[PDB]
Amino acid sequence: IQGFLKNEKDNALLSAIEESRKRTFGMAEEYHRESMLVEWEQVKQRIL
Amino acid sequence: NCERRRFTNLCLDAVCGYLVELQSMSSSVAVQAITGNFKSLQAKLERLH
Amino acid sequence: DGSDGSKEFSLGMWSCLHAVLELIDSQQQDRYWCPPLLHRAAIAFLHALWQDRRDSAMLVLRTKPKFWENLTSPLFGTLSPPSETSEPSILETCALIMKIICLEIYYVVKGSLDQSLKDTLKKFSIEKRFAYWSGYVKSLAVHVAETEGSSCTSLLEYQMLVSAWRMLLIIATTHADIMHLTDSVVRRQLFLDVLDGTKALLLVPASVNCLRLGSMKCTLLLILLRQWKRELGSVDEILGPLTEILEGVLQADQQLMEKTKAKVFSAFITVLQMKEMKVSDIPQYSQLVLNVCETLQEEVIALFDQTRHSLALGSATEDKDSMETDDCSRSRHRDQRDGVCVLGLHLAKELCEVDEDGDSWLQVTRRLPILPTLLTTLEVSLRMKQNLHFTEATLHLLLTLARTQQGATAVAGAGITQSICLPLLSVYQLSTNGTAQTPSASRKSLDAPSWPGVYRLSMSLMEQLLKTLRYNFLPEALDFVGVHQERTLQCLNAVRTVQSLACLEEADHTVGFILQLSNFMKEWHFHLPQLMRDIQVNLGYLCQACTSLLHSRKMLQHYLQNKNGDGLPSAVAQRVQRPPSAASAAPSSSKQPAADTEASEQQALHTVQYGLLKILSKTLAALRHFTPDVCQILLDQSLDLAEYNFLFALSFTTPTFDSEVAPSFGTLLATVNVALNMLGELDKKKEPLTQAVGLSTQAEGTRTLKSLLMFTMENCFYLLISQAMRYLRDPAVHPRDKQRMKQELSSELSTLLSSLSRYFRRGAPSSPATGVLPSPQGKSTSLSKASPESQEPLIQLVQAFVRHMQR
């Protein structure tokens, strides 16, 4: 029960750091991945 | 910069509150003038948002 | 002896438990008043039997009629308030009964528990005794903050009831199905009573007892918060008391309250993670960012000199035996994932995604020296390969800041390139003393903190800083690509041998930074006239590798399979001939193979094919900046050709996955056929499955993969036309094979354009296609909707080039 209450404190610290790091990686990649396509649509509308 | 749009709501809501209070009062020249002043203020806050 | 080979145990003629069972019987307390100090002593003996695992006695109490009804009867009483002189043996009695309930529900794993206990917990929920004991362990924690500095005697029994209530509620989340704690209004009350009931014990910064009890309830608060981050249906009631808890916790000793500052930051991160929020919402955001950044300046300076005493205390040893339990004086490493430093960095990195112009945060970091303070500690950490969680968390905060024009100029003006560029060389450098490779790379997440992850975030940060600052970070990007030139050239090649997803995630950032930098081709050619061409060649081979893998979808599946199973050497070989037959026979047993294996291998294959497609798209765009534009090389004859290399060989052979094969026009024609077949599967998977719920992001993935597949085709066609004009103009390219080039491209651009026009007459994802889609509604003239047959520019440009090859 003490090891289980150690583990519940550990998961109650650890997990939101991984949710925060997943937010940084996802929001950096999605901003490069969509900017590259908004840049490409600005190429296509110039070609037109 | 960030506060200003929270503050213009609170200022419009408060000006509406003071105008409800003023429009319950006995309509003296002072209550009439201040009802004009607060609606002149409202009619500027309605451009600050 | 049992009929079934088991042993029964019974309370024999001299069992002490016969007297214990009388002392707790409500149906003789109806007749003989058991005074509470004696009931306490009988219940303390029952707590020890449940603590010290004396199960041969517990089994023989679980089997007694009314045991759980009589034992829990004080939890169904009512107490006077803490401001009345109650007997504290009753508070201990209730705390000890709570410990017995906790130990029984913990050990008797979700099944074998007694039914009179199961219906007693049900009774405790139906009588709302959760809300009563919540309100009592709330008021008893205010009373301690109201009576510290007096000689308040019952403080040990108060600490026992607060610790027992913590234990009961972490079991009432994890065993909410057995505790009958399924009313979300009662859960919201339990949370707010633990919030207020923590606040009262953390606004008394001089009381070691309040700090101890409040830090213990903060351990409960943080668990309840995460287990209920769907039922706490408002955020804005929680942030205020968390700021008041923080500002109390910052007025108290760091050496105790490290293990509370961490919990409060961990709570704030969890609360910000519940809702989309702005600076308009958060109570005192401009002070909360101050409090967090000033705490971070305790932490990052204490980490800085911890990383310098580890540079002066040379040659400590691998002291590997110590099977010892949780004692003091052994030193606090500040690079723990749950350390106040690392939680403060992540809290700053959540708060920097709430202030859109950076204008609120920069009105704190124009006060505090913090940005260079983080960089000087990062600079030592990267040189030493020390402080991994801090190093990654610092790069996360910097990568968040580099998105805004205020954050990017503050990061550049803090000296970012100096504190990363030379230190980062250490990270991927190998020791030349060769020894054993440890195979303990077990199935951890791709978000497990790692030294390759630190390099990928450095590359992502330079892809981001150059995207935001451009000419105002261009020398810094040229020194950085010149210093990291080996790792840049390694990662362009690593896709040829190590097709693992974590390697594709490195290669995409390497080609991403190259794609931001090749916009400045003439500036890069002036400073690094070697490396820019070596990158052109290795981008060429990366195009060959990604297109041959994406085409050879079975070889890609096999290269994953042949690196997903292990462990058997054999050799010498030779040959041949025959079975057979046969025996025989019997019997059992039945398991099935999991179809979840074919689902997970396919999900890995689809993600690896998406990674290779991102890298191929970035590569084809980065290579286009190394060729003259299709308009320039069609329309001006004074345009020189010595400024621009041949990047593709004059073959139309389809690309082999092959070590020395330079990319060709057959590689480019294959890239378009790959993208056409992939786009040609995204309009097969359209049959109506139902009743699954909860995944939105597969709609977005079905959008972003289709716009990426267009980008892969259209930059490939730009390279094809530009390089075909680079061969067709050139005075040394033989007239025989200029005519061959006109001929073989005139065929396969005609077959491709016949296939493209057989796709686009369904509509690409667009406003004209959406306007043509109606039929019951949305129609004009007769059966027309919007206007049709606006063509997509590729279908005009590849036509113009094919017409000009047919002149």
Spell out the SS3 assignment of C121-156: HHHHHHCCHHHHHHHHHHHHHHHHHCCECECCCCHH
Q: For residue C81, what are its two tokens?
A: 């308030």
Cβ C362 vs Cβ C286: under 8 Å: no
Contact B1 C355 (CB under 8 A): no
Sign of CA dihedral C125, C127, C132, C133: negative
Query: How many whole angstroms separate alpha carbon C643 and alpha carbon C654?
Result: 28
Contact B5 C280 (CB under 8 A): yes
Query: How many whole angstroms separate alpha carbon C386 and alpha carbon C282?
Result: 35
The DSSP-derived string for C62-93 is HTSTTHHHHHTGGGGS-PPPTTS---HHHHHH
Q: For residue C705, what are its two tokens?
A: 């993969």
Q: For residue C282, what are its two tokens?
A: 């958060």
- Residues of chain C neighbouring A47 (CB-CB closer than 8 A): 793, 797
Query: How many whole angstroms separate alpha carbon C738 and alpha carbon C728?
Result: 6
Size of interface B-C (CB pairs under 8 A): 13
Cα–Cα nearest to C353, from C342, C343, C361: C361
Cα–Cα nearest to C674, from C544, C554, C547, C495: C547
Instruction: Kindly list the distances between the CA atom of residue A19 and the CA atoms of A28, A34, C111, C449, in Å, as whole numbers in the listed order.
Output: 14, 22, 33, 13
Q: To the nearest whole angstrom, how far is the Cα of C714 from the nearest Cα of chain A? A: 9
Cα–Cα nearest to C657, from C570, C586, C555: C555
A5 CB neighbour count, 10 Å cutoff: 18
The type of residue at C333 is H
Cα–Cα nearest to C386, from C438, C460, C449, C331: C449
Query: How many whole angstroms separate alpha carbon C240 and alpha carbon B3?
Result: 17
Query: How many whole angstroms separate alpha carbon C195 and alpha carbon C199?
Result: 6
Instruction: Kindly list the distances between the CA atom of residue C284 and the CA atoms of C238, C244, C252, C281, in Å, as whole numbers in the listed order.
Output: 13, 11, 21, 9
Query: How many whole angstroms separate alpha carbon C4 and alpha carbon C22?
Result: 32
Contact C222 A9 (CB under 8 A): yes
Query: How many whole angstroms separate alpha carbon C393 and alpha carbon A17?
Result: 9
Chain C interface includes B10 (CB < 8 A)? no
Q: To the nearest whole angstrom, how far is the Cα of A42 from the nearest Cα of chain C? A: 12
Query: How many whole angstroms separate alpha carbon C291 and alpha carbon C289?
Result: 6
Query: How many whole angstroms separate alpha carbon C524 and alpha carbon C287?
Result: 45
Cβ C644 vs Cβ C625: under 8 Å: no
Select from A8, A16, A24 the Cβ nearest to the Cβ of C396: A24
Query: How many whole angstroms separate alpha carbon C340 and alpha carbon C403?
Result: 25
C22 CB neighbour count, 10 Å cutoff: 14
> Angle at Cα A26 formed by Cα A25 and Cα A29, nearest 5°?
80
Cβ C665 vs Cβ C742: under 8 Å: no
Chain C interface includes B2 (CB < 8 A)? yes
Cα–Cα nearest to C73, from C19, C111, C115, C127: C127
Query: How many whole angstroms separate alpha carbon C540 and alpha carbon C544?
Result: 6
Q: Which residues, at least 6 apart from C545, have a Cβ–Cβ distance to it below 8 Å?
A: C495, C496, C657
Resolution in A: 12.0
Q: Which residues, at least 6 apart from C807, have a Cβ–Cβ distance to it below 8 Å?
A: none
| Residue of chain C nearest A39, judged by CA positions | C711
Query: How many whole angstroms separate alpha carbon C601 and alpha carbon C607?
Result: 10
Q: Which residues, at least 6 apart from C593, have a Cβ–Cβ distance to it below 8 Å?
A: none
- Length of chain C equals 807
SS3 label, residue C649: strand
Contact C360 B6 (CB under 8 A): no
Helices C405-412 and C451-469 pack at an angle, to 10 degrees, of 110
Q: Which of residues 13-42 of B touch C (CB under 8 A)?
A: none
Q: Which residues, at least 6 apart from C716, have a Cβ–Cβ distance to it below 8 Å?
A: C620, C668, C671, C672, C675
Cβ C89 vs Cβ C34: under 8 Å: no
Cα–Cα nearest to C136, from C180, C91, C97: C91
Query: How many whole angstroms separate alpha carbon C92 and alpha carbon C160?
Result: 7
Contact C357 B1 (CB under 8 A): yes
Contact C280 B1 (CB under 8 A): no
Q: To the nearest whole angstrom, how far is the Cα of C280 from the nearest Cα of chain B? A: 6
Contact A40 C392 (CB under 8 A): no
Helices C388-401 and C451-469 pack at an angle, to 10 degrees, of 20
What is the number of alpha carbons within 13 Å of residue C1 lying toward its C-beta?
2
The phi and psi torsions of C784 (rounded to 5 degrees) equal -80, 155
The phi and psi torsions of C150 (rounded to 5 degrees) equal -90, 165
Contact B1 C359 (CB under 8 A): yes
- Candidates C236, C277, C280: best to mutate against B (most CBs of B within 10 A) is C280
A34 CB neighbour count, 10 Å cutoff: 12
Look up tokens 């990426």; give the residue: C708
Instruction: Kindly list the distances between the CA atom of residue C146 and the CA atoms of C82, C83, C139, C143, C204, in Å, as whole numbers in the listed order.
Output: 11, 10, 10, 5, 10
Q: To the nearest whole angstrom, how far is the Cα of B7 from the nearest Cα of chain C? A: 9
Q: For residue C393, what are its two tokens?
A: 């968390």
Cβ C400 vs Cβ C353: under 8 Å: yes
Q: For residue C341, what are its two tokens?
A: 């430093």
- Residues of chain C neighbouring A25 (CB-CB closer than 8 A): 447
Q: To the nearest whole angstrom, how far is the Cα of C356 from the nearest Cα of chain B? A: 9
Q: To the nearest whole angstrom, how far is the Cα of B48 from the nearest Cα of chain C? A: 16
Q: For residue C331, what are its two tokens?
A: 């030193």
Query: How many whole angstroms separate alpha carbon A26 and alpha carbon C126?
Result: 45
C687 CB neighbour count, 10 Å cutoff: 5
Q: For residue A23, what are its two tokens?
A: 């937010």
Chains with 3 or more CB pairs closer than 8 angstroms to B? C
A38 CB neighbour count, 10 Å cutoff: 9
Cβ C199 vs Cβ C193: under 8 Å: no
Look up tokens 């749950």; give the residue: C338
SS3 label, residue C784: strand
- Residues of chain A neighbouring C618 (CB-CB closer than 8 A): 36
| Residue of chain C nearest B8, judged by CA positions | C280
Cβ C311 vs Cβ C318: under 8 Å: no
Q: For residue C161, what are its two tokens?
A: 């009831």
Helices C501-517 and C531-551 pack at an angle, to 10 degrees, of 140
Q: Which residues, at least 6 apart from C377, have a Cβ–Cβ distance to it below 8 Å?
A: C300, C301, C303, C304, C307, C387, C390, C394
Sign of CA dihedral C290, C295, C301, C307: negative
Chains with 3 or more CB pairs closer than 8 angstroms to A? C
> Angle at Cα C689 formed by Cα C686 and Cα C695, nearest 5°?
90
Cα–Cα nearest to C373, from C336, C338, C419: C419
The type of residue at B6 is R
Torsion of CA C32, C37, C39, C45, to 10 degrees: -150
Question: How far separated are the first and last CA of chain A, in Å rounded?
Answer: 69
The type of residue at C73 is S
Residues from C contacting B (CB-CB < 8 Å) are 278-280, 285, 355, 357, 359-360
Instruction: Kindly list the distances between the CA atom of residue C97 and the CA atoms of C50, C156, C186, in Å, as whole numbers in the listed order.
Output: 10, 17, 22
Helices C184-202 and C129-145 pack at an angle, to 10 degrees, of 10
Sign of CA dihedral C48, C51, C54, C55: positive
**Continuous H helices in C625-766:** 630-635, 665-682, 697-729, 735-760
- Residues of chain C neighbouring A24 (CB-CB closer than 8 A): 349, 396, 399-400
Q: For residue C678, what are its two tokens?
A: 């992939």
Query: How many whole angstroms separate alpha carbon C288 and alpha carbon C292?
Result: 6
DSSP C765: S
Q: To the nearest whole angstrom, how far is the Cα of C402 from the nearest Cα of chain A? A: 10
Cβ C414 vs Cβ C372: under 8 Å: yes
The phi and psi torsions of C717 (rounded to 5 degrees) equal -65, -35
Query: How many whole angstroms separate alpha carbon C182 and alpha carbon C194?
Result: 18
Cβ C722 vs Cβ C624: under 8 Å: yes
Torsion of CA C733, C739, C743, C746, to 10 degrees: 70
Chains with 3 or more CB pairs closer than 8 angstroms to C? A, B
Q: To the nearest whole angstrom, how far is the Cα of B23 from the nearest Cα of chain C? A: 31
Q: For residue C206, what are its two tokens?
A: 């001089």
Cα–Cα nearest to C192, from C138, C156, C229, C116: C138
Query: How many whole angstroms separate alpha carbon C134 and alpha carbon C188?
Result: 11
Cβ C76 vs Cβ C127: under 8 Å: yes
Size of interface A-C (CB pairs under 8 A): 101
